[PDB]
Scaffold this active site. Structure first.
Site, PDB file in Angstrom:
ATOM      1  N   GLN A 175      -4.881 -16.873 -24.586  1.00  0.00           N
ATOM      2  CA  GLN A 175      -5.770 -17.903 -24.027  1.00  0.00           C
ATOM      3  C   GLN A 175      -5.272 -18.517 -22.728  1.00  0.00           C
ATOM      4  O   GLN A 175      -6.057 -19.212 -22.052  1.00  0.00           O
ATOM      5  CB  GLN A 175      -5.956 -19.044 -25.041  1.00  0.00           C
ATOM      6  CG  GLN A 175      -6.909 -18.760 -26.160  1.00  0.00           C
ATOM      7  CD  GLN A 175      -6.979 -19.936 -27.150  1.00  0.00           C
ATOM      8  OE1 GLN A 175      -6.009 -20.240 -27.862  1.00  0.00           O
ATOM      9  NE2 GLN A 175      -8.109 -20.612 -27.172  1.00  0.00           N
TER      10      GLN A 175
ATOM     11  N   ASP B 190       2.593 -28.563 -30.344  1.00  0.00           N
ATOM     12  CA  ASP B 190       1.217 -29.008 -30.100  1.00  0.00           C
ATOM     13  C   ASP B 190       0.723 -28.591 -28.712  1.00  0.00           C
ATOM     14  O   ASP B 190      -0.454 -28.241 -28.547  1.00  0.00           O
ATOM     15  CB  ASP B 190       1.108 -30.542 -30.230  1.00  0.00           C
ATOM     16  CG  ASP B 190       0.761 -31.033 -31.648  1.00  0.00           C
ATOM     17  OD1 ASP B 190       0.842 -30.282 -32.642  1.00  0.00           O
ATOM     18  OD2 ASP B 190       0.417 -32.233 -31.762  1.00  0.00           O
TER      19      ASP B 190
ATOM     20  N   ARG C 130      -2.705 -17.938 -30.283  1.00  0.00           N
ATOM     21  CA  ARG C 130      -1.503 -17.606 -31.052  1.00  0.00           C
ATOM     22  C   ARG C 130      -1.692 -16.321 -31.852  1.00  0.00           C
ATOM     23  O   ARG C 130      -0.764 -15.504 -31.962  1.00  0.00           O
ATOM     24  CB  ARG C 130      -1.148 -18.751 -32.013  1.00  0.00           C
ATOM     25  CG  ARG C 130      -0.802 -20.038 -31.285  1.00  0.00           C
ATOM     26  CD  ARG C 130      -0.636 -21.204 -32.235  1.00  0.00           C
ATOM     27  NE  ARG C 130      -0.754 -22.473 -31.520  1.00  0.00           N
ATOM     28  CZ  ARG C 130      -0.702 -23.670 -32.102  1.00  0.00           C
ATOM     29  NH1 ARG C 130      -0.544 -23.765 -33.416  1.00  0.00           N
ATOM     30  NH2 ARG C 130      -0.821 -24.776 -31.368  1.00  0.00           N
ATOM     31  N   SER C 131      -2.874 -16.153 -32.459  1.00  0.00           N
ATOM     32  CA  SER C 131      -3.170 -14.949 -33.250  1.00  0.00           C
ATOM     33  C   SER C 131      -3.064 -13.688 -32.391  1.00  0.00           C
ATOM     34  O   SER C 131      -2.578 -12.643 -32.852  1.00  0.00           O
ATOM     35  CB  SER C 131      -4.575 -15.030 -33.852  1.00  0.00           C
ATOM     36  OG  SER C 131      -4.690 -16.036 -34.873  1.00  0.00           O
TER      37      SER C 131
ATOM     38  N   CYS D 240      -5.362 -18.726 -36.419  1.00  0.00           N
ATOM     39  CA  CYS D 240      -4.876 -20.008 -35.914  1.00  0.00           C
ATOM     40  C   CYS D 240      -6.082 -20.946 -35.968  1.00  0.00           C
ATOM     41  O   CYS D 240      -6.796 -20.934 -36.969  1.00  0.00           O
ATOM     42  CB  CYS D 240      -4.227 -19.839 -34.537  1.00  0.00           C
ATOM     43  SG  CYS D 240      -5.189 -18.816 -33.301  1.00  0.00           S
TER      44      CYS D 240
END
Ligand SMILES: CC(=O)c1ccccc1Oc1ccccc1
Length: 282
Positions: free
Chosen positions: A262, A181, A221-222, A215
């Site tokens: 990010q 998370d 994440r992508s 994502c």
């Protein structure tokens, strides 16, 4: 510089935030006018994450052709990817229309439906064989065929039917279920094992349309997934693998979708994944 020793040099000097801010400063800025039209507000999950006009995927529909999705075309590596946001309640039909129209074989999902106690994307595939889904706005039917649950990821076989033509196709759903998370994984080993399973399926190969990867926003994440895949492919193709510059590859991918990677932690994790992956390939 090479990668593994540039890596230790940034760790020892604690300068990951400065490296990452340089990337943010040099990244491309292109218009995203279609995304910002008022009629498309409920088609965007986040107001600050939009596809560029020049690289956006168009739906084959004359009313409204908009979806928050981008084509990342990597010329030297000879790989293409579609990066998209997690589908919204009012875009699940558009999502599967795109899969159909772009001739994709695989969908790569890097998030859970609920994270941090909030919904990060719609439940857009069926959970039981006998309870199929019909998307009436785009005239598609979707059936769960089989499901294989492993410790770090799940693979599903799905059947997508175009109800207008009665044509059917097999779609593979690759679901990485264990990204934490908060932060990034401590080791890249399970993420790399997952990448290799996607590769082994044929879903990234030129005989199919581009893989769809998402994502929640489709940039963090992508971005890590496609950056690691492309860098490893270039290291196999070139005479001198130490010439692969991960920062330059990332800036090239950011010509096609804003915001890829990010955080500075995601940047460090991408370096780690490519470094460890290059040892296993040989
Ligand atoms: C592959 C398999 O064992 C199978 C068997 C019966 C029905 C469907 C099956 O998978 C499919 C078939 C078509 C498209 C997608 C998956």
């Amino acid at each position: 510089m090479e990668m593994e020793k540039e890596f230790e040099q940034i760790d020892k000097s604690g300068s990951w935030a400065a490296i990452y801010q340089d990337i943010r400063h040099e990244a491309s800025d292109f218009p995203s006018r279609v995304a910002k039209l008022p009629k498309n507000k409920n088609r965007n999950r986040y107001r600050d994450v939009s596809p560029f006009d020049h690289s956006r995927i168009k739906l084959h529909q004359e009313d409204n052709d908009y979806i928050n999705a981008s084509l990342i075309k990597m010329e030297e590596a000879q790989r293409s990817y579609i990066l998209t946001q997690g589908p919204l309640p009012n875009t699940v039909g558009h999502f599967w229309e795109m899969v159909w129209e772009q001739k994709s074989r695989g969908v790569v999902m890097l998030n859970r439906v609920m994270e941090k106690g909030s919904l990060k994307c719609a439940q857009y595939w069926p959970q039981k064989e006998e309870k199929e889904m019909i998307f009436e706005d785009t005239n598609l039917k979707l059936t769960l065929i089989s499901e294989d649950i492993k410790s770090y990821y799940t693979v599903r076989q799905l059947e997508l039917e175009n109800l207008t033509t009665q044509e059917t196709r097999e779609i593979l759903h690759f679901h990485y279920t264990t990204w934490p998370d908060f932060g990034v994984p401590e080791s890249p080993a399970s993420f790399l094992n997952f990448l290799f399973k996607v590769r082994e399926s044929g879903s990234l190969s030129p005989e199919h349309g581009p893989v769809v990867v998402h994502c929640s926003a489709g940039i963090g994440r992508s971005g890590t997934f496609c950056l690691a895949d492309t860098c490893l492919l270039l290291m196999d193709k070139r005479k001198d693998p130490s010439s692969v510059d991960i920062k330059k590859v990332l800036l090239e991918m950011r010509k096609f979708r804003m915001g890829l990677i990010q955080t500075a932690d995601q940047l460090r994790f991408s370096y780690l994944a490519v470094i460890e992956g290059a040892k296993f390939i040989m």
